[PDB]
Ligand binder design. Structure first.
Ligand SMILES: O[C@@H]1[C@@H](O)[C@H](O[C@@H]2CO[C@@H](O[C@@H]3CO[C@@H](O)[C@H](O)[C@H]3O)[C@H](O)[C@H]2O)OC[C@H]1O
Ligand SMILES: [Ca+2]
Ligand code: NA
Length: 132
């Protein structure tokens, strides 16, 4: 998976750098893309060296789930700074993807990102939004 990436271009969830998960799989999507799924509560997924430049204050992910769930977005490590939490309610199916966004604290420079899952969700991709 890429050693580094831009926060303001699409990051593919399936191109993660490490995970604690023993269940997570790379899945396909209806339009023949890929994502991550078979995720459980407590699973973490790390993406290395994301460059936030002069600042990001939002996070958007394209996700599908049948259960209400949340994803913490942390900087640097699973116990690093909580940037924000994306709350995802049911999208209607494991294959019905929806772009969902949340606010985060402003982050600058280069940091690993860790997504921390409280339950099952399929994630295709994500991206950050710049501060004003
Ligand atoms: O070709 C694509 C298929 O591979 C794709 O299959 C889906 C893959 O993800 C599955 O989602 C899991 C369902 O079970 C939950 O408990 C897990 O947490 C989910 O990750 C989904 O159910 C499959 O249908 O579908 C799209 C096809 O184009
Ligand atoms: Ca993807
Ligand atoms: Na394992």
């Amino acid at each position: 998976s890429p050693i580094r990436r831009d926060a303001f271009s699409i990051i593919e969830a399936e191109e993660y750098n490490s995970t604690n998960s023993s269940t997570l799989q790379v899945i396909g999507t209806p339009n023949n893309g890929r994502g991550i799924g078979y995720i459980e509560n407590g699973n973490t997924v790390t993406y290395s060296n994301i460059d936030f430049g002069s600042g990001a204050t939002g996070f958007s992910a394209t996700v599908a789930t049948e259960v209400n769930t949340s994803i913490q977005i942390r900087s640097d490590s699973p116990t690093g700074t909580l940037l924000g939490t994306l709350y995802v309610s049911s999208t209607g199916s494991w294959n019905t993807y929806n772009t969902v966004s949340t606010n985060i604290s402003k982050i600058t420079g280069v940091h690993d990102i860790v997504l921390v899952f409280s339950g099952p969700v399929n994630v295709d991709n994500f991206i950050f939004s710049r501060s004003s």
